[PDB]
Each structure stands twice: as structure tokens, then as C-alpha cells.
Amino acid sequence: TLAVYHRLWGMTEQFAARKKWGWRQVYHRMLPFQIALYPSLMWYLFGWFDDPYKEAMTLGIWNVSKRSLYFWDPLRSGGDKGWY
Amino acid sequence: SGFGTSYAHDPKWIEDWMARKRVGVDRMDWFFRAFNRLRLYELFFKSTPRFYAFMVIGGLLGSYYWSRFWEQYWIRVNKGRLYKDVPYVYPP
């Protein structure tokens, strides 16, 4: 019967590895939350980047021609040298 | 009739109106069937992280193109009256 007791004692030998697995499973289930975080960061930090990187980050969809008709810097609406 | 008195009561036409319960009728179901064929629920809404990503990514792209549309609307309404639309002629 000590044999039975040996197994019943040993069934919990690897507690540290089981608790690590549980927390990894939690971390796995949080990974999908990146799909909303990373874009939201770039959305807020877009204006910090330079014009050249704004274009790459958007795959060319944004460029200087896409700056508003009334750009926040009035002297640079329609380009760095103005409209004409 | 009886409007404006203690005898006020619903007219016959208001009562006939409330007799039309439209039970069993569904005339707008076509729109929901068609919207459900876009699979937005199975792909984005059902999962919370994906629902958040739809609101974020959809708000990033929606905000940009909404601005784009109303910029073009403005450029058209004010055609000929904007600085860009009237290059200045320097005096000789």
C-alpha cells in the first residue's frame, strides 16, 4: 500500500510547472488584445512621426497632399512651400 | 374629442391606429438577413478583443475618410472662393 501512497504523494510533484502553465494559458488568452492596442497607439502617436514615416506606416495612403486644406500650420497648407 | 377638457378622450382615428398591432408582420427582415451575410458577428463582434479591434481600426479608417469626404464637399461648395483656387497676380 505504500506504493499507492507513493503515487498519491507524487501526483503533485510538479506544482511549479503546472502553475507556470496556468499563467501561460492566461497570457495566451491576452495576446489577442494586441490587435486593438498596437493600432490605437499608432493612431494617437501618428502626428509624432515624420512625414516620410507617416507614408510608409499607411502604405502610401497618407501623404502631404492629404493634409487638410487648413493645416494646423497655416503657412504649410498645400505643401511645405505653400500652394504657390 | 373633448380636447382641452376633463372629458378628453382618444379620437376614433387614434383608437383605430392602436388597433393595428402588425402582429406576425416583419417587413424589414430582408435587411437583417443581408447584414448577417457579412459575417461581422462571427469574425469581429463575438470576441471581445476583436470587437475592440473593430472599434479602433474602424474608427481610425472611418475618421480619416469621413474627413476626406467633407473636405471635398467643402472644396466644391466654395469653389473659386478659396485661396488655392485663385492664384494671386503680382502688381507690375
UniProtKB/TrEMBL annotation, chain A:
Keywords, in A-Z order: Membrane, Transmembrane, Transmembrane helix
Transmembrane segments: 30-49
Official protein name in the record: Uncharacterized protein
